[PDB]
Amino acid sequence: KSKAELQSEERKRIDELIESGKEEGMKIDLIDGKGRGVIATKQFSRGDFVVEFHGDLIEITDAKKREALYATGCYMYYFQYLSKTYCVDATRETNRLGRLINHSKCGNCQTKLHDIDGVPHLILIASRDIAAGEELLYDYGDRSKASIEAHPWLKH
């Protein structure tokens, strides 16, 4: 297969996983010092789709409004797309697992923007093989002095 053919196939796998919302190979656990986390129940291989960070897709004005009212945990994921700020707001309690995944700067998932015909989705891709029983972790990416003073776990 060519690079394009491999990319096409991966896109098709991802699109179909976004659509099904299929969230296999993961479960909730209580992890010391973190509250809930999500742990692998099967091995994931480097590059596998893991899960969508799924919630309410919103623009910046609404995201500010909502965060003024929340300030309730932190389940808001900001990103840039076509020169504008969006947010995936996962505050509302659902059975979706991406929202329960905890933070590490040296985790095992990497968030990627995935476009489907003009609608942006935030997806987690395994950045290395992930062992059964290990906690899923990605970088939340807030390095601000204000946040880290209050939440030193952001530093690690």
């Binding site: 965060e67 929340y70 300030a71 932190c74 808001m76 994921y77 900001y78 990103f79 840039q80 968030t111 923007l113 935030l122 970088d139 939340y140 990416g141 807030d142 601000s144 946040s147 209050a150 939440h151 952001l154």
Partner: peptide, 8 residues
């Protein structure tokens, strides 16, 4: 009191 997540 709060932090966010930011795609990087």
């Amino acid at each position: 009191k709060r932090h966010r997540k930011v795609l990087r």
